[PDB]
Design a binder for these strands. Sequence first.
RNA 1: UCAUCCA
Length: 426
Amino acid sequence: ELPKFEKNFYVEHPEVARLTPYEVDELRRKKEITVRGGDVCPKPVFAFHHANFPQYVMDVLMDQHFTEPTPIQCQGFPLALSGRDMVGIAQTGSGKTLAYLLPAIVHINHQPYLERGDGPICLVLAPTRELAQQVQQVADDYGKCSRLKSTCIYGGAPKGPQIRDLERGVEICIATPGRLIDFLESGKTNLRRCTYLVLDEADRMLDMGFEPQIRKIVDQIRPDRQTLMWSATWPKEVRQLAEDFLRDYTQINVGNLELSANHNILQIVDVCMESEKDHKLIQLMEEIMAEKENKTIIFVETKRRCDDLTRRMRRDGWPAMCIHGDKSQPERDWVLNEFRSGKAPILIATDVASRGLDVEDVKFVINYDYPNSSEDYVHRIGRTARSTNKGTAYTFFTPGNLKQARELIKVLEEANQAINPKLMQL
RNA sequence: UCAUCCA
Ligand SMILES: Nc1ncnc2c1ncn2[C@@H]1O[C@H](COP(=O)(O)OP(=O)(O)O)[C@@H](O)[C@H]1O
Ligand code: BEF
Ligand SMILES: [Mg+2]
């Protein structure tokens, strides 16, 4: 007794249709694409015009001076445009956002118009407020010359304007889970029209803190929806759990199937004692801040250490500001915007800034504290070397971090990085 | 630990 709908909007372009099985295999080999699943996977595309996006989307793309789709776009576009459930795993900074947003636009464009009272057609869930806001900004860039309406549903901002967006009608909603659950409970929106569901940073969204919130939301979406999950990491602990939210899905990987970092990052690991970190940070910042572009993110383990380090650095004269979950949302957005503009070129952060954020010209990531997992390491260092850029990561590793040493060495080896002998000694 | 509704 539910309304019928379509989700397959894909026809192979003739240039893709006429690829031989050998040419398709060589395309996947050269782009390091692996596909797994029960149904035959569509061939990868290799040019944007193979996707038959609307002309206004092509104009924004051709603006960006992208010369070709990234590997995850090459395989993700035709899978998503074909209406398939999918998990897309690809390196940080490799274009996963447009891999799900552009097929969302195509999906929306083929659905019946929104009538007053209708909820969103596309829902994208993200683990942090700033990431949700960033994704909405990308969506609006590509739907600017269309009649597509978006909103960002997230905590720490006034409800009024969000409620008015939902009441007027939005085709795409980007949300963090808490505020969305709030609005769903009180009937400020509903998911009766949601047929395209994206979990960005999906392995984070399926962790112990988020999974009950995600389950509460996704339980309200029709099971014949299309579900698309994306991340740079896919640890064993979330894999069978993810299948609770997927039907007849295909998994795409780019690069190594094990945990791996973006190979455009120069990864440096300094094995030292906890007491040596502050002196070594000052030495490092003295070298970094004498360079032309010096935009740097410094990651620490706790909100308290974030505050303490920022206070100490600002007193020593460094133009540093911090972002963490105990700051007000206006202060969080203000600090991130000053970092984006370069007015505050040093950002000190908890893991609130470890995933998804795409900031122009970050040249250095410093792990002042090694993170809680090697997956977090891969996301943190991926704040640099995004798109066709390189960058550097510098990590302080203490004997207290020993239990993480083996997994860190494997990541370094997979990325062809030089291994500090003091690290291998551990 | 860190995120994630405080109206
Ligand atoms: N085909 C492409 N070629 C080059 N750069 C791209 C392409 N697609 C997207 N980008 C850029 O790459 C950067 C990282 O994209 P993002 O979607 O944030 O990465 P991910 O989600 O994979 O970590 C963004 O600035 C985006 O504009
Ligand atoms: F993996 Be991208 F950094 F969101
Ligand atoms: Mg992303």
